Motif scaffolding. Structure first.
Motif, mmCIF file in Angstrom:
data_model
loop_
_atom_site.group_PDB
_atom_site.id
_atom_site.type_symbol
_atom_site.label_atom_id
_atom_site.label_comp_id
_atom_site.label_asym_id
_atom_site.label_seq_id
_atom_site.Cartn_x
_atom_site.Cartn_y
_atom_site.Cartn_z
ATOM 1 N N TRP A 76 85.750 18.619 78.839
ATOM 2 C CA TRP A 76 85.496 17.374 77.986
ATOM 3 C C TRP A 76 83.751 17.416 77.978
ATOM 4 O O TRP A 76 83.085 16.694 77.258
ATOM 5 N N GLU A 125 81.125 17.554 72.387
ATOM 6 C CA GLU A 125 81.916 17.987 71.673
ATOM 7 C C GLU A 125 82.063 18.912 71.474
ATOM 8 O O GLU A 125 83.456 19.480 70.694
ATOM 9 N N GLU A 183 85.709 21.277 71.420
ATOM 10 C CA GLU A 183 85.757 21.906 70.232
ATOM 11 C C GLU A 183 86.473 23.078 70.767
ATOM 12 O O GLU A 183 87.532 23.378 70.006
ATOM 13 N N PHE A 224 89.167 14.441 71.772
ATOM 14 C CA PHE A 224 88.215 14.349 72.543
ATOM 15 C C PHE A 224 87.759 12.346 72.781
ATOM 16 O O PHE A 224 87.555 12.849 73.278
ATOM 17 N N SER A 225 88.513 12.018 71.301
ATOM 18 C CA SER A 225 87.716 10.506 70.972
ATOM 19 C C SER A 225 89.126 9.869 72.493
ATOM 20 O O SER A 225 88.113 9.129 73.193
ATOM 21 N N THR A 226 90.198 10.429 72.099
ATOM 22 C CA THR A 226 90.751 9.677 73.602
ATOM 23 C C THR A 226 90.153 10.390 74.932
ATOM 24 O O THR A 226 90.063 8.679 75.635
ATOM 25 N N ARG A 243 87.039 10.354 75.796
ATOM 26 C CA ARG A 243 86.169 9.658 76.103
ATOM 27 C C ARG A 243 86.068 8.142 75.836
ATOM 28 O O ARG A 243 85.787 7.022 76.774
ATOM 29 N N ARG A 244 87.371 7.659 75.865
ATOM 30 C CA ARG A 244 87.726 6.102 75.297
ATOM 31 C C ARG A 244 88.219 5.979 77.008
ATOM 32 O O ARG A 244 87.838 4.863 77.059
#
Ligand SMILES: [Cl-]
Ligand SMILES: [Cl-]
Ligand SMILES: [Cl-]
Ligand SMILES: [Cl-]
Ligand SMILES: [Cl-]
Ligand SMILES: [Cl-]
Length: 468
Positions: free
Chosen positions: A423, A427, A431, A451-453, A455-456
């Motif tokens: 990651w 992005e 993907e 991805f958002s998880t 990054r978070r």
């Protein structure tokens, strides 16, 4: 390092070490999905992919020793590095047996999955037959330590791992040593607190990255190394180390408070006794990669080396302005003025070291934050939070790894690990990686992070205090 005496094991009563001759690596379900050029290292002389003599290739990193005394440059280097280590208040008290074996802060439990070494491997006795995570039992270990004692031979194995096309052809497979469980334990008691301090303090004071977590550590590196970067590679670092570097390492540990008797384990690493298959042999110099603390000791020695070369070449150097972080042979450093690394490499050559440009470069070029790598990873500032830096493992390396497996029962952990690496590449790259993983049914049976998880959780990880 150099091989000083070889003999048929049977002439001295040692049985043949029956080390596996076939790789545990097999093509994974993702082998056809992704591209790659790496294959399992050669593990035996008869391998049909060989284009050179195996045994010669594997033992060829023992290039010899320079037979020098500890010189003026080395002495000042030791003094300078010992000055930094001193601020850390490393305890030279032995680490309690249970802490040394079963885990403690800054020192994970002795791996129960690696080789117990000699004589255990000859007797079919595995680490798990002696040790117990559940019970933390030490009674059997102590019996074993008393029965067999210390200073036992090391067992030499060929490392089973992926290698480039060229390294397969040349039989350039890597050797690792399995210290006897008795010696591993005694070394972890003797140096455990030093191991712990190092692990809890990766950076420019220990000058070590051993045990670091790149996701967190990368953002600190450019804060620590704020001048003109210095980086280069070594060829066969471990085996090139001459005894003089171990003598320097012993002086360094004595300044830290270790007694002469305590540094005796450094002679065990330097002037070593090995079993390789049907041979028994002695080596003088060279770090025996795989024994207790080799990454740490290799790192400490590197700190001595680089300071030595700079003092030698740049008589006006001010070491208080030099910074470096080593992980064994891998180094990333900085100095406020430009430094000519080709000059340092010639100085290194006089010391029996082979230094080349960073990353298979043809010239000791300028190292920039764009082209610098450490632990194979690049450095890329986050676009939104510029003070946070992504460790960037190339997608090519992630691809090489996903195409093979030593045990498909671990597909989920293997792939998840790769995703934590991938990651950072962005992005779109992520993907695409995910889309390709799901292009085979196994890929859709796995719990893969969003991805958002990723990054978070990465952004949040910098919020939680870390003990040092
Ligand atoms: Cl690909
Ligand atoms: Cl291996
Ligand atoms: Cl870290
Ligand atoms: Cl290599
Ligand atoms: Cl100078
Ligand atoms: Cl921290």
């Amino acid at each position: 390092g150099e091989i000083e005496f070889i003999e048929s094991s049977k002439d001295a009563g040692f049985p043949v070490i029956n080390t596996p001759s076939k790789t545990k690596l097999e093509p994974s379900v993702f082998h056809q999905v992704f591209e790659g050029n790496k294959e399992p290292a050669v593990l035996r002389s008869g391998d049909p992919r060989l284009k050179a003599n195996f045994e010669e290739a594997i033992f060829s990193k023992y290039i010899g020793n320079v037979n020098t005394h500890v010189d003026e440059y080395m002495l000042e280097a030791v003094d300078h590095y010992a000055g930094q280590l001193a601020t850390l208040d490393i305890s030279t008290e032995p680490m309690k047996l249970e802490d040394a074996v079963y885990g403690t802060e800054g020192l994970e439990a002795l791996d129960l999955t690696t080789s117990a070494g000699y004589p255990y491997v000859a007797l079919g006795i595995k680490k798990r037959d002696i040790l117990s995570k559940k019970t933390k039992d030490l009674t059997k270990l102590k019996e074993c330590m008393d029965k067999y004692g210390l200073n036992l031979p090391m067992v030499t194995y060929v490392k089973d791992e992926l290698r480039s096309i060229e390294k397969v052809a040349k039989g350039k497979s890597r050797l690792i040593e399995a210290s006897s469980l008795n010696d591993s334990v005694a070394m972890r008691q003797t140096f455990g607190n030093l191991y712990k301090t190092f692990h809890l303090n990766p950076g420019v004071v220990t000058g070590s990255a051993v045990g670091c977590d790149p996701d967190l550590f990368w953002s600190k590196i450019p804060v620590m190394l704020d001048g003109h970067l210095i980086a280069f590679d070594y060829s066969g670092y471990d085996a090139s180390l001459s005894p003089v570097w171990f003598a320097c390492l012993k002086m360094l540990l004595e300044k830290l408070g270790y007694t002469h008797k305590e540094t005796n384990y450094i002679d065990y690493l330097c002037n070593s006794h090995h079993l390789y298959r049907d041979k028994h042999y002695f080596v003088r110099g060279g770090m025996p990669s795989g024994c207790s603390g080799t990454s740490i000791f290799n790192s400490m020695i590197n700190n001595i080396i680089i300071r030595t070369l700079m003092l030698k070449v740049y008589k006006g150097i001010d070491l208080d302005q030099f910074r470096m972080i080593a992980y064994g042979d891998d180094v990333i450093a900085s100095y406020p003025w430009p430094i000519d690394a080709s000059l340092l490499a010639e100085a290194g050559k006089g010391y029996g070291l082979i230094m080349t440009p960073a990353d298979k470069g043809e010239c000791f070029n300028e190292v920039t934050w764009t082209n610098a790598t450490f632990l194979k990873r690049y450095f890329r500032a986050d676009e939104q939070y510029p003070f946070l830096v992504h460790p960037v493992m190339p997608m090519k390396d992630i691809h090489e790894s996903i195409r093979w497996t030593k045990d498909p029962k671990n597909t989920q952990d293997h792939v998840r690990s790769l995703c934590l690496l991938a990651w950072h590449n962005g992005e779109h790259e992520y993907e695409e990686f995910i889309r390709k993983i799901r292009s085979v049914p196994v890929g859709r049976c796995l719990t893969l992070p969003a991805f958002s998880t990723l990054r978070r959780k990465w952004l949040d990880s910098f919020h939680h205090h870390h003990h040092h």
